[PDB]
Amino acid sequence: SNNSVPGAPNRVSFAKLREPLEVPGLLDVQTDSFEWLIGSPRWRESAAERGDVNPVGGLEEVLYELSPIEDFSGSMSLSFSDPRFDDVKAPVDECKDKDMTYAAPLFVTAEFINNNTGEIKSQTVFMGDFPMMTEKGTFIINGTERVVVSQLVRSPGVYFDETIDKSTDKTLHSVKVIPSRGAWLEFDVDKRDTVGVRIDRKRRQPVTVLLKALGWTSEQIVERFGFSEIMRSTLEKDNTVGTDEALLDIYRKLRPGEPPTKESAQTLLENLFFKEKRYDLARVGRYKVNKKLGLHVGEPITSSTLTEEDVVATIEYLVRLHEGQTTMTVPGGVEVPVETDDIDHFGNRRLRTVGELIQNQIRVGMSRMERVVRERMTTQDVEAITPQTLINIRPVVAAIKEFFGTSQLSQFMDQNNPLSGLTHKRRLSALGPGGLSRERAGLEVRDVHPSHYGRMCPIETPEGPNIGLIGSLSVYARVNPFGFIETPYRKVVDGVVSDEIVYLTADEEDRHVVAQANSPIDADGRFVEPRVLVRRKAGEVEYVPSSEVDYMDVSPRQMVSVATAMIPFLEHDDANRALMGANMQRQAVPLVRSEAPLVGTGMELRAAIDAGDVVVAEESGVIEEVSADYITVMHDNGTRRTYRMRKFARSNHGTCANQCPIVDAGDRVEAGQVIADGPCTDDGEMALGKNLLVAIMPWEGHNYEDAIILSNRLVEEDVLTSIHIEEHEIDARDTKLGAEEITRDIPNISDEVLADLDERGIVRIGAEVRDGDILVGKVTPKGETELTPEERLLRAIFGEKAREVRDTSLKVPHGESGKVIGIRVFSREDEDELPAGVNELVRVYVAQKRKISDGDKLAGRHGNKGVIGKILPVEDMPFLADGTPVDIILNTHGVPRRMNIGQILETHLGWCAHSGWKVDAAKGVPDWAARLPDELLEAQPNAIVSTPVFDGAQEAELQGLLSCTLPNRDGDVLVDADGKAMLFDGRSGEPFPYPVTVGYMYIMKLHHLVDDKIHARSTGPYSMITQQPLGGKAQFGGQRFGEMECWAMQAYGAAYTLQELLTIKSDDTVGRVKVYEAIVKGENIPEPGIPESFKVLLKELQSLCLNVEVLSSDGAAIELRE
Amino acid sequence: VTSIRIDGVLHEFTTVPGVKEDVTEIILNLKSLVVSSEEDEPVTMYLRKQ
Amino acid sequence: VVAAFQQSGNSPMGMVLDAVPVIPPELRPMVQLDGGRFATSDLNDLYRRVINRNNRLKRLIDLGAPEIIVNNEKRMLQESVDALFDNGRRGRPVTGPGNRPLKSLSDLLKGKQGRFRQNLLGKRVDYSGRSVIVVGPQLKLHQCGL
């Protein structure tokens, strides 16, 4: 019915029929921006459909802006235009495998013109390899999949700030004109009722100075401002009249110490304020100013800088606002409201996506290249110059290579599961280059503004220190061409709801009236109640008669992100816990064999199918050959296609990315139907955890304070085992004493150690390894004497080798284990591109099948995290009357405090879904079944259901369902009307005195595993510089002993323990060996020595010429030499 | 069962040509096999098909 | 000042140096990376800068140089030693390429990253371990699982 994806499993849902439109392509934010950048024809036709004219792409824009290039003489002219792209060099798969980027060549036709000769020359120019976004929105660099996240930046334009004086308590109004690029220019009003102007953060001089520098006369200024006396009083304090006077005064003020001239100040003032070369806004700036001042609304975008009319208009705006004027029309314009501009209002914060960022980097690179070409244009002679010798592509390629490699907006893709990547692609970040730092942000730029409704999701946000700065785009939001964020709406004319959908920005939503989508409506298309709830400007909400409501929203889930749209019963949970619930699905771990959840919210199907990690058939056909590695399908016309599937490939965070077919041979399929589910997917739906039978009761203290008790059945049937794949990399470079070589003959190592290697020197595939075992044998020559180039060349001509080696092999780090599954070997002599200086590079992959145990972290969907506390045997768990022991026991002291009551509801519904229900239809449908759709009247056992957020199952319906459930195979009803059941204690035997809550719950498995945290050390490697033990876990290091522990030890009066923890354990180079020998021999521990830190301090002091010596008790001198 | 050997394979995390399911699922299915025995020594069975 | 000088017992000659000591090598490491770029401490640069001018003065004394040039070089040597003991104490500080302020000897103590604090409060010890904790209710009050 409501499903649009072919072949998907049916999922009956509690809902009220809502279908103006379906969820848009969830990745259009990352895709259409780049499409516009390269100007692909699809973007062109989409723009033509939208109604706009003059289709110009980002590259075309920057190139037309750059053209033309001339010297000071103007004899020679150059220009570029019409950029074109070609086919990609190689498909994505080998780009991942061969560690080569995914690029396409870029060509531009360039023409050079010389006026004196009158001759032109045009030819094609290659300008590097432009990176290309794949089908899934992720760029590929050097074999790693990187993603570029959008940014939130203050929009260029004019802002009218208001302030209230401390003493006079008058309403002052200041203006600021923030440009895209140039020098700042703003107007100020003080308590003296004087109007002044500041340029480039200089002092205050009256705007009368600017008005006279415009060349205007006093009479004209009087006529323009004859309705205001504050302006007249401000002009009264003028120093002198005269255009030259204003020009010279401005020249002296801006640039003291410079010569005055009549003809100079005009030139530099014009350059600074009205010339595109130096000062320039953007398209958005002109659009915003035109919208604010309402001048030439139909004027197409031609200029991109200030006009005198703009300054006059903003002066009029300021003077009218300072005297409390309401409505203002600049002459020849239209009437617009007058009000202050909110700083963080979402009509002023602009979303610069990937396209604009890449365009900015391109503009910088071509600016550098244009500097170079201008420098080298005059140097060489005219008749012997061609553009090929004029353009050096070095800066452009350097810039586009550096931005990806370093800039804080090109981040590694998070590939824990499809949801993580999908949410990572749509993230909006307020930090980054050109934006405010972490310490610049205050409490005004973090909390939700009322204009976020429908644009930025207010619930999803990292819980760390970055809170508020990082947000997620809403479900239905799309970005307008300029960079603002639009939302859909329905058109309501007069109590009549239409199916036309109109997209609105922030300001249009401000200027109208809008109503919620859950307000009752009649089937004919009319409102029922006279007074409906309506949101209005400044966040006010009130009741209003139905005869003037402009717009009605689309769906109840219009304000939530994608991540938070997958939480059932979202409206029953507190916002604080919902944040943690939404921030834990981005941390799940794909399991060996996944299961679809019993109670979902319907969003997961679209989420999975747009995440791109599930292979979807492109064109209809039938299945010819289906095998675990590939699927072959013949189209209708007879053409064939073969889809290959990735098996056991490493993700970024160590998990496994595995794909399996679901279809079988001879099965007719339709275009768009899923055929091979990826990781964390079952039957094309986002599955992240399992369905566990849970009970809610404290239990003899093993689940005290957020612990969880699990049954051993989970470990038995491997319900929760995952797979982790680590990678190890070694590389042999060319030393100055010779050359390292992968060899099987390690110096003086017994063969039992070297049993598992082949002749090459690489561990055979499939041999289980352990810490301290050799993976790749390597030898590096010993520095006995530098080899003279004569002997080295003599031996290299005949290809000779000598016996001077020391072992530097690769061993499994402390803690790892598993089986080797794949070995990649790269060599320079085999025409493979490598970094300079190296010859052979070996990557060895070690895979291990983990299980669940103590310390592992589990979590439900509603942010009820916890840690495993004890894994009881199967017979110890309490069991129902039937005899099926529960799989997990929660705790009840944690529900009322956190107010995540929603999980309880879900638990009940889970059981109703598991055993199936059959409502009695005799004597008609009951009262509580009136609104319930007829699809849910009967259900088979373990049949999945849905529950959209801010809609869906109601308390009465659920209560009715709990009383009409089917019996089991033995004609018994295990649970009661309230939802509880009569458990039996399995440890003793007696039944529990009171019934307990039991149900089914969807439980995930977070990625904080114990086996990568447990760590121990008694005596291992020491650092060679500081004589302290190494750090980290892979280095077999020790634990930091912070100063707070030092205070805590001093508090007890403990002295010997502190001295020992600081002397013979850490950096007493003689004491440590002595204590080891004493312990291993059984004698008393000798006295501590003296730490190396103190001797270092003494040497540093003596190196400053300060004679420091250590005296004895009486006064006799002592030396610490030895 | 306690151990299996498959011709043409070395470890579990891989696949074999001509089979719709890789080795991991084969092991997972073979786990729930029901076998009854009385000899006190590790006995061996075979399974081949084409 | 003067009473302290008299009573303590100390030759004021310490205020004028004729033999500048040289810190050991290990406290100024010079490490060759695999990338071919020699990680060089700044102390080596300062020592080299001093020694060049000292040798030039030694060469100019025995060649009968005129008074003005030897005076200039003596001034330069004094400035070089002053930079060695404490960079940035006077005028334009000595800086390496990239406008990096060089680390002098006195920057081994002064500042939070100095020796007197940074390396003296906080250490890494042996015989230690770390793991995730879990509530266990069958223990007496003075026991811990391991």
Place this chain on the structure above:
Amino acid sequence: VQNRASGAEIGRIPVDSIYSPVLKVTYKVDATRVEQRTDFDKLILDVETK
């Protein structure tokens, strides 16, 4: 993994094992508790295996 320590050939794949044949067990008690010396418990034990 209790079986991988044998150090046998590279082809053998260790596999978990569930030796227990019993699948489900439950019980009920019928109590004759009328106040006399005639109080007793009848135990009904239900067993299902594989």
Place this chain on the structure above:
Amino acid sequence: VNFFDELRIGLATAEDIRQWSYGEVKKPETINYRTLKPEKDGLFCEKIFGPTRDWECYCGKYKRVRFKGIICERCGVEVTRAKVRRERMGHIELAAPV
């Protein structure tokens, strides 16, 4: 740690500095570019500070642990543990008081 019941600081005179050091430094260069080894009388000279490799000299006459505390005649280095490279100091004789 022993009995350092007092610790006194004081100005160091030229005689004290001449007493501490184990030779003067005369070559401004730091380390040989090609040999990758320090040069004699340079900033890492083995004659002053000590041996770069334990129980060895530049010429390698006494390369064995048997000797201890004795100085080779050809190269004039002292055979002890490499740890001493963290202790010994040099000095520079100025030609004009500073």
